[PDB]
From Swiss-Prot:
It comes from Mus musculus. Disulfide bonds join 24-98. This is Butyrophilin-like protein 2. The gene is Btnl2. It is found in: Membrane. Highly expressed in intestine and at reduced levels in lung and stomach. Also expressed in thymus, spleen, lymph nodes, T-cells, B-cells, and macrophages. GO terms for cellular component: membrane. One of its GO terms (biological process) is negative regulation of T cell receptor signaling pathway. Keywords: Disulfide bond, Glycoprotein, Immunoglobulin domain, Membrane, Repeat, Signal-anchor, Transmembrane, Transmembrane helix. The chain holds residues 28 to 143 of 454 of the full protein.
Amino acid sequence: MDFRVVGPNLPILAKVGEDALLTCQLLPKRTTAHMEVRWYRSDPDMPVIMYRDGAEVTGLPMEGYGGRAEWMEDSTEEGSVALKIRQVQPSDDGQYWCRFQEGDYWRETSVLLQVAA
């Protein structure tokens, strides 16, 4: 009950082949060294990409998924975050959940993104 993420963000419209912007608002306790943030593409079972210890996971070299998604921090800088995803498609069209994980307690919320087809 010490962390909360909200999805007040308005629907995002990006055309197929154009990049999209996933966004949600979270409040870090202090230093995101141990904080983890996960985004899901209409599939909570598997995360597309994650942000941990102030860095996004790249895994193996020439990352297809990691390469596709790059973190773009919001201008407001009030605990909000945004993730830039390249070459959107109908599969992207839908909802994405942000997952704030710290210690043994975490919370998540959906963000509205509707890409043009």
